[PDB]
Amino acid sequence: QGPAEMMKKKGNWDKTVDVSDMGPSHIINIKKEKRETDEETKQILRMLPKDVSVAELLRELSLTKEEELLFLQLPDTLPGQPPTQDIAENACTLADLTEGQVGKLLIRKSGRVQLLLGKVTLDVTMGTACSFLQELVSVGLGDSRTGEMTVLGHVKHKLVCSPDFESLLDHKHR
Amino acid sequence: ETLEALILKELSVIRDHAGSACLRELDKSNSPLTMALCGSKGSFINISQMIACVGQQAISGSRVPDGFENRSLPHFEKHSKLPAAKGFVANSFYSGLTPTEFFFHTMAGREGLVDTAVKTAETGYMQRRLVKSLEDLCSQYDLTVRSST
Amino acid sequence: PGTQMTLKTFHFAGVASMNITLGVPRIKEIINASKAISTPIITAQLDKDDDADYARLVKGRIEKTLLGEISEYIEEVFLPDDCFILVKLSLERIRLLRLEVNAETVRYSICTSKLRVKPGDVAVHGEAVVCVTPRENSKSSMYYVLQFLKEDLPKVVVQGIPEVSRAVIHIDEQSGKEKYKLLVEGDNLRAVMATHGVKGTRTTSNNTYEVEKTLGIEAARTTIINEIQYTMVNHGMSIDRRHVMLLS
Amino acid sequence: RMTVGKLIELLAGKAGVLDGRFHYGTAFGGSKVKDVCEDLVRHGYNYLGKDYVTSGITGEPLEAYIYFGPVYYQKLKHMVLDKMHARARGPRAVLTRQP
Amino acid sequence: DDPVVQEIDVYLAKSLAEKLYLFQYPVRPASMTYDDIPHLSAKIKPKQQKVELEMAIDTLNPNYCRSKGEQIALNVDGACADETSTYSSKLMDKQTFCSSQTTSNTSRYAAALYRQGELHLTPLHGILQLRPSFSYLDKADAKHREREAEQARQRRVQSYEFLQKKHAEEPWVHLHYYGLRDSRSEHERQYLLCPGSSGVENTELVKSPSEYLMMLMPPSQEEEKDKPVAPSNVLSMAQLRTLPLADQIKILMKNVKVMPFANLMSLLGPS
Amino acid sequence: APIPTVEEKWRLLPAFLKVKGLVKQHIDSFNYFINVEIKKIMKANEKVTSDADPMWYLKYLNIYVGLPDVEESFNVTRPVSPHECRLRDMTYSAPITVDIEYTRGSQRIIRNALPIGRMPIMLRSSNCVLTGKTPAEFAKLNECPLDPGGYFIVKGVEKVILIQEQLSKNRIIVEADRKGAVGASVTSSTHEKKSRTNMAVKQGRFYLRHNTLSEDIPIVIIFKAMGVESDQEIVQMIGTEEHVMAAFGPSLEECQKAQIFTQMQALKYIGNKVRRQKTKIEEARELLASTILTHVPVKEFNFRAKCIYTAVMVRRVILAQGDNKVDDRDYYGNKRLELAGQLLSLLFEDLFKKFNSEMKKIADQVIPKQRAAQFDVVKHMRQDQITNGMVNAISTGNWSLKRFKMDRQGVTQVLSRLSYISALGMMTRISSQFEKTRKVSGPRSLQPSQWGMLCPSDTPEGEACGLVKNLALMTHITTDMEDGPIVKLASNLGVEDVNLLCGEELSYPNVFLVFLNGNILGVIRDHKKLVNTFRLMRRAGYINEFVSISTNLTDRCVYISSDGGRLCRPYIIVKKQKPAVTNKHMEELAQGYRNFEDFLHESLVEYLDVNEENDCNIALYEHTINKDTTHLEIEPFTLLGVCAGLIPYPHHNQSPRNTYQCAMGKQAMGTIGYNQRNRIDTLMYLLAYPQKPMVKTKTIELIEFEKLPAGQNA
Amino acid sequence: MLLFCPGCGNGLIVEEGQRCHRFSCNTCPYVHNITRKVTNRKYPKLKEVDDVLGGA
Numbered sequence A: 001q002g003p004a005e006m007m008k009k010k011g012n013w014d015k016t017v018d019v020s021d022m023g024p025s026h027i028i029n030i031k032k033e034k035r036e037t038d039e040e041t042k043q044i045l046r047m048l049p050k051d052v053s054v055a056e057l058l059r060e061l062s063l064t065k066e067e068e069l070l071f072l073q074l075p076d077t078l079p080g081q082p083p084t085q086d087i088a089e090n091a092c093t094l095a096d097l098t099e100g101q102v103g104k105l106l107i108r109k110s111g112r113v114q115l116l117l118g119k120v121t122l123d124v125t126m127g128t129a130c131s132f133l134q135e136l137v138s139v140g141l142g143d144s145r146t147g148e149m150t151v152l153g154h155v156k157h158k159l160v161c162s163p164d165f166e167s168l169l170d171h172k173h174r
Numbered sequence B: 001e002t003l004e005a006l007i008l009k010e011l012s013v014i015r016d017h018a019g020s021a022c023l024r025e026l027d028k029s030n031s032p033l034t035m036a037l038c039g040s041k042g043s044f045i046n047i048s049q050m051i052a053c054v055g056q057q058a059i060s061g062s063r064v065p066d067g068f069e070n071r072s073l074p075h076f077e078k079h080s081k082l083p084a085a086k087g088f089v090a091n092s093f094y095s096g097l098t099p100t101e102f103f104f105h106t107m108a109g110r111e112g113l114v115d116t117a118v119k120t121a122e123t124g125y126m127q128r129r130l131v132k133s134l135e136d137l138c139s140q141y142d143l144t145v146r147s148s149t
Numbered sequence C: 001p002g003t004q005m006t007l008k009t010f011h012f013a014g015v016a017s018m019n020i021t022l023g024v025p026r027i028k029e030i031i032n033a034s035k036a037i038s039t040p041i042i043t044a045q046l047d048k049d050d051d052a053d054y055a056r057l058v059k060g061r062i063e064k065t066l067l068g069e070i071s072e073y074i075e076e077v078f079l080p081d082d083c084f085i086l087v088k089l090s091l092e093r094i095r096l097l098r099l100e101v102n103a104e105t106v107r108y109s110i111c112t113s114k115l116r117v118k119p120g121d122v123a124v125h126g127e128a129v130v131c132v133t134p135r136e137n138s139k140s141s142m143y144y145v146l147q148f149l150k151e152d153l154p155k156v157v158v159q160g161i162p163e164v165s166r167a168v169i170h171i172d173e174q175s176g177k178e179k180y181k182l183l184v185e186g187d188n189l190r191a192v193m194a195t196h197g198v199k200g201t202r203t204t205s206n207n208t209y210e211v212e213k214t215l216g217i218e219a220a221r222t223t224i225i226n227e228i229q230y231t232m233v234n235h236g237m238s239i240d241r242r243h244v245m246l247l248s
Numbered sequence D: 001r002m003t004v005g006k007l008i009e010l011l012a013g014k015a016g017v018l019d020g021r022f023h024y025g026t027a028f029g030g031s032k033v034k035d036v037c038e039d040l041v042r043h044g045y046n047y048l049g050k051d052y053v054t055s056g057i058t059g060e061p062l063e064a065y066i067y068f069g070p071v072y073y074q075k076l077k078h079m080v081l082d083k084m085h086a087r088a089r090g091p092r093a094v095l096t097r098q099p
Numbered sequence E: 001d002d003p004v005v006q007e008i009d010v011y012l013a014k015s016l017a018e019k020l021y022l023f024q025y026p027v028r029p030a031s032m033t034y035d036d037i038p039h040l041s042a043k044i045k046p047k048q049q050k051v052e053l054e055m056a057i058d059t060l061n062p063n064y065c066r067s068k069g070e071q072i073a074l075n076v077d078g079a080c081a082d083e084t085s086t087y088s089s090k091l092m093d094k095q096t097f098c099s100s101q102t103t104s105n106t107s108r109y110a111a112a113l114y115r116q117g118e119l120h121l122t123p124l125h126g127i128l129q130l131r132p133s134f135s136y137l138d139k140a141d142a143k144h145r146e147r148e149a150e151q152a153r154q155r156r157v158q159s160y161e162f163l164q165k166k167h168a169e170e171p172w173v174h175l176h177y178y179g180l181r182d183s184r185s186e187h188e189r190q191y192l193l194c195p196g197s198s199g200v201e202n203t204e205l206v207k208s209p210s211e212y213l214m215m216l217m218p219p220s221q222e223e224e225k226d227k228p229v230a231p232s233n234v235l236s237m238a239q240l241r242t243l244p245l246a247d248q249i250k251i252l253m254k255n256v257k258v259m260p261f262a263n264l265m266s267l268l269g270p271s
Numbered sequence F: 001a002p003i004p005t006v007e008e009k010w011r012l013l014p015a016f017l018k019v020k021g022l023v024k025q026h027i028d029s030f031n032y033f034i035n036v037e038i039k040k041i042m043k044a045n046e047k048v049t050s051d052a053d054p055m056w057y058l059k060y061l062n063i064y065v066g067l068p069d070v071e072e073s074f075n076v077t078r079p080v081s082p083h084e085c086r087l088r089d090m091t092y093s094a095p096i097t098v099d100i101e102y103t104r105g106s107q108r109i110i111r112n113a114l115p116i117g118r119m120p121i122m123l124r125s126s127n128c129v130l131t132g133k134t135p136a137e138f139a140k141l142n143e144c145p146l147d148p149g150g151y152f153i154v155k156g157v158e159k160v161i162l163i164q165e166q167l168s169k170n171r172i173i174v175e176a177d178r179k180g181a182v183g184a185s186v187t188s189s190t191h192e193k194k195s196r197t198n199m200a201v202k203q204g205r206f207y208l209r210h211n212t213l214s215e216d217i218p219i220v221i222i223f224k225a226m227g228v229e230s231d232q233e234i235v236q237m238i239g240t241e242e243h244v245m246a247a248f249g250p251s252l253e254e255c256q257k258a259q260i261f262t263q264m265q266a267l268k269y270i271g272n273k274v275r276r277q278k279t280k281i282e283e284a285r286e287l288l289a290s291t292i293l294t295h296v297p298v299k300e301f302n303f304r305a306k307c308i309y310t311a312v313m314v315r316r317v318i319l320a321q322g323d324n325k326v327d328d329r330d331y332y333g334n335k336r337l338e339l340a341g342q343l344l345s346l347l348f349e350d351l352f353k354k355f356n357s358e359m360k361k362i363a364d365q366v367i368p369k370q371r372a373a374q375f376d377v378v379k380h381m382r383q384d385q386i387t388n389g390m391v392n393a394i395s396t397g398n399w400s401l402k403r404f405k406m407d408r409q410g411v412t413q414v415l416s417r418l419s420y421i422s423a424l425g426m427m428t429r430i431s432s433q434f435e436k437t438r439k440v441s442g443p444r445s446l447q448p449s450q451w452g453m454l455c456p457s458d459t460p461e462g463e464a465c466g467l468v469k470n471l472a473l474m475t476h477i478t479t480d481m482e483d484g485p486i487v488k489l490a491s492n493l494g495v496e497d498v499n500l501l502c503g504e505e506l507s508y509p510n511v512f513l514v515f516l517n518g519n520i521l522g523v524i525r526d527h528k529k530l531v532n533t534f535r536l537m538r539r540a541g542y543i544n545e546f547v548s549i550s551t552n553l554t555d556r557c558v559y560i561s562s563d564g565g566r567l568c569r570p571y572i573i574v575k576k577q578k579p580a581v582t583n584k585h586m587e588e589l590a591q592g593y594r595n596f597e598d599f600l601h602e603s604l605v606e607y608l609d610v611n612e613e614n615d616c617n618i619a620l621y622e623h624t625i626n627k628d629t630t631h632l633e634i635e636p637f638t639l640l641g642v643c644a645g646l647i648p649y650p651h652h653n654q655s656p657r658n659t660y661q662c663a664m665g666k667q668a669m670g671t672i673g674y675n676q677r678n679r680i681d682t683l684m685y686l687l688a689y690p691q692k693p694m695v696k697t698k699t700i701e702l703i704e705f706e707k708l709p710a711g712q713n714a
Numbered sequence G: 001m002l003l004f005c006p007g008c009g010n011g012l013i014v015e016e017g018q019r020c021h022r023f024s025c026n027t028c029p030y031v032h033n034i035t036r037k038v039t040n041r042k043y044p045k046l047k048e049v050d051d052v053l054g055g056a
């Protein structure tokens, strides 16, 4: 039994100096030291789960309906054409696309997530979560030498976008 | 190892009784039998392979090791341990072997055939180092053994 | 002989383990008389060959043991005013092992080959747990050397022969006697002979150099001939003994 | 040595010559002995290739039957006319004056 | 199984395209942020965009060894000279961070903001990692060391010095810091909410899947090594691509000697 | 009830053999060389530059190789046959000419016809007389229709360039030393950079070894010098596994004891340690930039890529402690083959470079000063050098590529004309590197990776047993790839650049790496969908059919291979418990409508590399197919080679008896060709009345052996 | 067990604390003062059963 084997160590070791609320003994709770994992960074005690994209959207939409920042990875080309530029070798891209409503996203029975893209459909998948921190900013460069900067928020999760080549070559087999 | 000892045990029993269930059915005046009785050429254990069943083809005294990832060849499932998948060959030289059996058996043949030259590599230099230290000793007329001095 | 030999498989002395080298390489090593050699097997005889538990007990007395195995738990300990290394002893295991040890025996082991530590640095609280204190490094390294110490002491030997690796009880079945005998590997004969229980006057080593070092050259002359004949016959080639007696 | 294929080849070649056909012997296949054996009896030969034989030195029949058939034999480049050699006292090397 | 749920629309905003930059600290676990820390100066080199920060840190607090701070403060700067002093005070009240560029092309990456029923997208003008500066040891070493103390052609185009001169040619552009707690943040965050209706047919995204495949993964070779007149052995079931029919039958009839026509249109196609 | 067997599968073997197969390795490799490789190698050295006088230069613009012809005593020429060369001791060769431009004070002097040297021609290659001829017009050249080709004629003696076998390059491997201590090493070979790198763990902390340093150097110091200044990064790049970091932990104490913590401190610390012939900073930095782990690419001073490379290799060492087992030294997936083309190309590079530079020597010695008027290069543009080098290398049989620093010998052998078989069996031979220099003793034996690629039962009697070997009867050796498109597919399919990640990510068990030819690409999830996407695109035929993909789930890495020199073999594709091929297809092939290539694009067969052979399952005979099958075996007897194919019923004999016959077929007296009476050879054995065997194999009908028989029926 | 400085990210080291012992950064003034009792767990392996029960 734990305590029974523990008694002899209990008889000697159980001293501590955590009651010393003074300079060369105190710690401020915000300035914790660091262990290698964010989850493990709970070192001063006073006493990962799995998820799927559909569920994440479901929480952000129903269980707590609140806006959040994301970051996504785009495939090299979109199923249009370089607007009035006619490819040299420049790929159709989102960088210069027009503002406003542009498309939709849909998820299926059994949880398959896909992105409606005009005539075609494209698959989206979640990237890798991380312990460390990321933020989004912008700069008001109003003058040639000086300006002001703004931070908008912190990104939570990131995604990749990828067309399913199987559903692409099936239109007419090569 | 406990398992594998039981495996080789059973397989050896298969050959022991297969040969046993062959030697008694052979006629007298059978030729391999006559040449193996008087002992000039062959052995009983040899007749059994040539008629009844070729044995577990051990490599260096072990079952054939896995060459690919967790299997000896693609033709068998990963982590498989069944007898055929680790060297056992069920055919005799009379029915003729099958591709995997032929490949495993030729692996065991080459292992030995590499040896004959090599096992002469050390033998020569024992033959030298010994005689080059000991060829001088001779037996004298007073029945003692004396060196050159 | 080195040419006619077959060198067949399954040489395990009937215990399906602890095989040794044979034939050409073995003889090549016997005759070189190298003072160091692999597979240093040693045989020994018991006081009573049917006393199974006592055979195990002497096995325990002779086998090498470490602080890191006689204990199921060890921990570094940090306190706001002290730092020290703690060990928790496997009491029930020691009973099961029939090991002739006590907590303080570690203390005796301590201060040997461990660089300036003193017995007073060790606090033997009781039968269950014992602990040790660090010291100021004072040069070439920092006080936090605790880490190196903490992972090093578990390695220290506490009981048994340092030079032995493992020992095996061999059993027999023949009608003459169904008894036990002790087989040991490790290159030091003098130690195994110097214990209670072992019938030391019958102990035998396979490597020549040790038996020469302990019993004199006239015992070496006999170990050669035993060894060569043993390996020849355990292959199965017939060489007249007068032909090997000259060589020895 | 265990060369069974040499026992079979001598049989299949016999049925081939008697019937006018070349028999395949590929690996992991080829003509089967269970089947060649019947082509012999069609011509009046024993279904396992061993025949009667009479001794040419005595004229009285042998006591065993003998295994006759056609086998492919291939002659090799190592002839003995090229290998005999014998020296009495020929030339010598200059540096170390032995033969 | 049909796309039966969560049919959210998508929108795009260009208002912040050239303004968005992404900053992260690999050394900072996500469980706390720098909201409480005043950044005392900020800087950018817009050409070859690269970023430096400067911020304050508390000193009176128990997790600060003020004695150590003073002792190393006397060393990182000139002990009593302060020619290029980084701290007028004798204590480390500030730190500085450096940044590292992450990629040479940010075009394939965009920021996304989720809202109930709508998604808004905008590209990223840059992504830089952030580094804590360790240079104070370097200048302590420099202080201690200094206290202790035509032309021929070259093949040095790949020089470190040349690219450092190119880097040094750009002076540092400074900015005024404003934290996330400033109403400025929301005042500008609304710009990403682009105007528009719920859904309109896009001018782009017109190409067909087969077309989308071909220009997605174009032929690596733009001109074929040999002609389809079969100067070398060539496909037969994959009908010759442009060969005139009268020559197609010639190709087919060099293979087979005789042939009733009724099976041909399977090879040349029913059309 | 069994699946109905497609009995006509064996027809595919003649269809494969009538294009690929025997002797075609040598012919194809030389054909590739003289037609696309010579042009690149000249392109790489297109211009030479003067010592003075700006805008003075001499330029090559194109180069040609012509067709074989002979000198004659009146600077006049005629074409020659192979046999006129055998009878006259001449050398079967074709002139090399270039279209040189050189400066004259006048802005140009064009040229198109200029003899720069001579090139020996391989028989039956695209530039020889014999190619494309018909058997009835062979007789007029005195040549024999059946002759294998693929060899050279030099000074009148037929010579062969044996297939060489190399170990794979730019590929990490961990091993245990003789002392038991673990280690790792790679050979970072670019076109010339054969320099090695190595690391050691000799005491419980990790260190590097090099010829470039005078001592050994631990890991963390170099990690600091590389631009990783903080300690928090290391546990990221190594992983958060507690026992892994616990093992690693002590390997940094000896570093952090030394008060070197910022990159330049490290640099000046290592800079003083270089084996030279403060500046030590830059001297160390260039070293760390160009000469260490060179095969891993980096843009200028973005060291991150090779940082992770060291991290991953070290991680493997850590897990080597948990389990000592490693990949065998001779697993054939890790061994590459060199043919006539690669060998010859490496020689012509050094010889051409040395020609150009020596021309520069004589030019520099006169051009600026030694005359009042400009010199002309035609007074020195000489052409015996290339000829001498080429012929001497092929005839003598040993090369010294002193730029590459290799001085190998035994590259050529005279073609044994003992019989018909000895010639063929010689053409498919392989030699090896060891050559009894070390007591390896292991590689002599047969490994199961050799299945079907190499003949089991063909290896020489005596001491070289197991060193020399022979190609199987159906096997292709792949050529090198230009690496263009395949990177794009991964970039789109879901890879995430490691440059963008922190290092914790490789720790999760739910992520995989992806490499390409030993080079790093990113990080992937759901490796399976990558493999399915790749094979589905390769079957329909976008990517090249010889590209291969494979996985190793213990290492959680996915390997992409497109390099040349690794063997491949065809198999039928099977799906849903039934083969793709059908009896109707096979009838059409017999009738001649569809040929082998059609089978390739209809996704009915495909090539499997030995490295990818590991991951699939193969059924031998169709009646053994089950749910897990992924291919099928076309014809099992192609496991056997060319000389092992004369033995009837080999699967009945005891194998040592089949090895001995595999070496007496190469000695039986027989017939040699149809022109056997016209050739004057140094020694030639013939039989008077040869007969064809009564029991005959099927390989004995593919090689047309019973047209040139070597025995009698007794 | 390794521990890193929040101030500068480098591994923290124990030192002779003035009142209570101390982790301190080797370079930056960030420090950490030991309040609680703390240990780390090893749990080494023991001997197998075969020859520990065999022969009693």
Ligand SMILES: [Zn+2]
Pocket (backbone or CB within 6 Å): G004, G005, G006, G007, G008, G009, G010, G011, G012, G024, G025, G026, G027, G028, G030
């Ligand atoms: Zn720190």
